């Protein structure tokens, strides 16, 4: 089949660890499964861990990027479901970073039986400000971002990576994220950037039935703190919010000492 060439090969699927329960880790825009490097060592002894890359990431084949399939987030949610079915995983804890949080939400709406919980990191149901909604961006801000990608992809990557990652502009996390951003095919980065930035998942939040743990940095370029409160209030499922005293959109990569313990508590404990 209902959701789908090897699925495991196309998504660079890696299955590691051992245990009764399975954790599936979904990464955000501009990075890949390497974003979970500091988390994975704390999971492998207790859980089976599934890592995969989103179609369109620089580590994936650009010839497999189906513009119709990925014209909405549902295309990524069907790839996630196909990965779970391919592996015969009947239930998982899903940890979704950035766009993967909404991808996970959508997959749980299509298949709630496959998810016991969703742990979101840097999630947002809508980036653009609306009448009674603070997303953090005006349409003009996105228009400037897309113009910069059209004009000079390399310069945009170098200017955007320290802003998205936060903290020290010469850190290893900034260098890793500039590298994975620049590994994307520029036209795919622009197409995906537009699909994500123009998404609006608000209407479906009350229909979510899988419990959600909402985690984010207090200072995140793409996610005002208010978005975490908006998610908690509007998700129809049982949810909990934890705002971390950290800076950055990829905090599990840039501040692991303070961020990893928080992610671990939400994975290991139920609401």
97 annotated active-site? no
213 annotated active-site? no
Q: Please name which of 110, 82, 107, 113 lies closest in space to residue 95, comparing C-alpha atoms.
A: 107
Buried b (16+ CB within 10 A) or exposed e, 77-97: bbbbbbbbbebeeeebbbbbb
Distance CA 84, CA 90 (A): 7
Q: Tell me which of 249, 254, 255, 266 is the catalytic residue.
A: 249
Q: Is 35 within 8 Å of 259 (Cβ atoms)?
A: no
Q: Tell me which of 77, 98, 122, 239 is the catalytic residue.
A: 98
3-class DSSP state for residue 64?
helix
Distance CA 36, CA 235 (A): 26
Q: Tell me which of 79, 108, 220, 254 is the catalytic residue.
A: 220
220 annotated active-site? yes
Say which residue the tokens 């909404």 belong to: 102
Distance CA 115, CA 136 (A): 29
Distance of CA 38 to the CA centre of its chain: 16
Active site residues: 98, 220, 249
């Amino acid at each position: 089949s209902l959701y789908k060439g090897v699925v495991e090969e196309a998504h660079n699927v890696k299955v590691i660890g051992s245990g009764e329960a399975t954790i599936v880790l979904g990464h955000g825009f501009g990075t890949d499964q390497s974003v979970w490097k500091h988390l994975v060592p704390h999971l492998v002894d207790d859980y089976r861990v599934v890592l995969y890359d989103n179609m369109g990431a620089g580590t994936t084949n650009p010839d497999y990027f189906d513009f119709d399939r990925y014209s909405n987030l549902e295309g990524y949610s069907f790839d996630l479901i196909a990965i779970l079915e391919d592996l015969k995983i009947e239930s998982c804890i899903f940890v979704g970073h950035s766009v993967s949080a909404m991808i996970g939400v959508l997959a749980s709406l299509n298949r709630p039986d496959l998810f016991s919980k969703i742990v979101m990191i840097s999630a947002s149901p809508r980036y653009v400000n609306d009448v009674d909604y603070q997303g953090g961006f005006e349409q003009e801000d996105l228009n400037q971002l897309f113009e910069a990608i059209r004009s000079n992809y390399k310069a945009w990557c170098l200017g955007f990576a320290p802003l998205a990652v936060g903290g020290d502009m010469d850190s290893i996390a900034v260098q890793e994220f500039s590298r994975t951003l620049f590994n994307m095919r520029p036209d795919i980065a622009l197409s995906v950037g537009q699909t994500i930035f123009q998404s609006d998942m608000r209407q479906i939040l009350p229909f979510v039935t899988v419990p959600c743990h909402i985690l984010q940095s207090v200072k995140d370029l793409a996610v005002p703190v208010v978005v975490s409160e908006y998610l908690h209030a509007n998700l129809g499922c049982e949810s909990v919010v934890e705002v971390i005293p950290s800076d950055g959109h990829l905090p599990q990569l840039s501040s692991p000492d303070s961020v990893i313990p928080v992610i671990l508590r939400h994975i290991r404990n139920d609401i």
